[PDB]
């Protein structure tokens, strides 16, 4: 029950269709910046079990509409529901401090609204939650988001089967995962720099979430 773990990780995140399993493991090791050995060694297994973003690493969920970047600068978001794990004011704020990271380095403003007309819609959900893209239960993948555009695009979803928190202690930082996911909602894809925010695996950090590769990546966009 380890080769099946690898076959599902590789399939879900896009290495299998791009690719023995050696070649596909080699695409993953490169894309995640692991020792590219081509074997299902221990380090690849460790990575395959680390919590991470559900967005594929090669390819996308699907063909999206448009050029996957916003063509206006007053970006409006809607917090559609909350998790029970944190006071609403703390959740409202984490999403505000997550968006602030990105305005701090782009020509975009983030304004909260109370309408399904928002460009970015934020929603907590579990298993199948109204997209075609069900979550997986506790741990595993923690969230996903979609490229800019109409309707479902630009939206950000968070696995409410997890325990959402902020700083240390138990649970995943809603602030850091949101900041990663809003990256996806602004046009960014996953980075391969282990210490970047758009790196797909979850790493708790204090101090600045944004890394050189993120600000450079957000810039060739806006």
């Amino acid at each position: 029950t380890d080769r099946q773990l690898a076959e599902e990780y590789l399939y879900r995140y896009g290495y299998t269709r791009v690719a023995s399993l050696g070649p596909a493991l080699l695409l993953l090791q490169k894309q995640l910046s692991l020792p590219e050995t081509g074997e299902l060694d221990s380090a690849t297994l460790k990575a395959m079990r680390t919590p991470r973003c559900g967005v594929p690493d090669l390819g996308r969920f699907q063909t999206f509409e448009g050029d996957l970047k916003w063509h206006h600068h007053n970006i409006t978001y809607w917090i559609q529901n909350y998790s029970e794990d944190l006071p609403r004011a703390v959740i409202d704020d984490a999403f505000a401090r997550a968006f602030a990271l990105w305005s701090a380095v782009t020509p975009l403003t983030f304004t909260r609204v109370y309408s399904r007309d928002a460009d970015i819609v934020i929603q907590f959900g579990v298993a199948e939650h109204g997209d075609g893209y069900p979550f997986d239960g506790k741990d595993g993948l923690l969230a996903h988001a979609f490229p800019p555009g109409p309707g479902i695009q630009g939206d950000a979803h968070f696995d409410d089967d997890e325990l959402w928190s902020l700083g240390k202690g138990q649970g995943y930082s809603l602030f850091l995962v949101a900041a990663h996911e809003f990256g996806h909602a602004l046009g960014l894809d996953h980075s391969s720099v282990p210490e970047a925010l758009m790196y797909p695996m979850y790493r708790f950090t204090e101090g600045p979430p944004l890394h050189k590769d993120d600000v450079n990546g957000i810039r060739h966009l806006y």
Partner: antibody
Framework: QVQLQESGPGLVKPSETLSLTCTVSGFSLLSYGVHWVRQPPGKGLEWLGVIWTGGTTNYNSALMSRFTISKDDSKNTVYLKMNSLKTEDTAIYYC?????????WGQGTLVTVSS | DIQMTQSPSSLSASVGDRVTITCKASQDVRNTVAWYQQKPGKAPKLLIYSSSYRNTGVPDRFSGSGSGTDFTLTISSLQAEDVAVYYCQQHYITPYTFGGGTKVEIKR
């Protein structure tokens, strides 16, 4: 301007197969899910199924797997195929766009199952 | 399956009265309830979404509340043009079941 419209034959014979086409305009099936809802005349609405943006479906178990949904994102069409039609299937069929609610609906097409 | 129970199945009121329709969910359904207004020979119209949000172009007299299992649609001042059947629906878990309708008619 968002629009949806259903087309397909109204009269179908018992135990045969129905095909309705939902032709969409004003939005992208890559960005919105599309749902099918039916309503027997004078009765209330029953949810049938959904085809999501990425192409996976979900169907009402009450339809004993007789009913399927496919789409063509390029041509802006959603297809409902329901076979082994029973008399109970006589209703108006709607396709509707879903985004936190079914905000835009077809005009509905009546399907009479009859010999 | 989740059952949605709308009460009453019909009601008759006068222009200006305040009307209240309820919709009970057989299990917790969070805030994912939407209200539709359907006029005869026409398709339904999205009226309320996410329990309490008013779709674009919907007058202020239409209001929705509730969360969990019990949801309420309120027309604060019923007007003659508001005659229709009103349906509730949950979209928390497939099948996205509907209530049975509430027919609203007018006294005059």
């Amino acid at each position: 301007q968002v629009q949806l419209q259903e087309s397909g034959p109204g009269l179908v014979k018992p135990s045969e197969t129905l095909s309705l086409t939902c032709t969409v305009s004003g939005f992208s099936l890559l960005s919105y899910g599309v749902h099918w809802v039916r309503q027997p005349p004078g009765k209330g609405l029953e949810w049938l199924g959904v085809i999501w943006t990425g192409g996976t479906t979900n169907y009402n178990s009450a339809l004993m797997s007789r009913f399927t949904i496919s789409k063509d994102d390029s041509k802006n069409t959603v297809y409902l195929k329901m076979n082994s039609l029973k008399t109970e299937d006589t209703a108006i069929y709607y396709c509707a766009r879903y985004y936190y609610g079914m905000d835009y609906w077809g005009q509905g097409t009546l399907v009479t199952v009859s010999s | 399956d989740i059952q949605m129970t709308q009460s009453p199945s019909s009601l008759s009121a006068s222009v200006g009265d305040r009307v209240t329709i309820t919709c009970k969910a057989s299990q917790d359904v969070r805030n994912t309830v939407a209200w539709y207004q359907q006029k005869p020979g026409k398709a339904p119209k999205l009226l309320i979404y996410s329990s309490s949000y008013r779709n674009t172009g919907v007058p202020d007299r239409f209001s929705g509340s509730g969360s969990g299992t019990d949801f309420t649609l309120t027309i604060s001042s019923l007007q003659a043009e508001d005659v229709a059947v009103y349906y509730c629906q949950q979209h928390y878990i497939t099948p996205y079941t509907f209530g049975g309708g509430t027919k609203v008619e007018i006294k005059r």
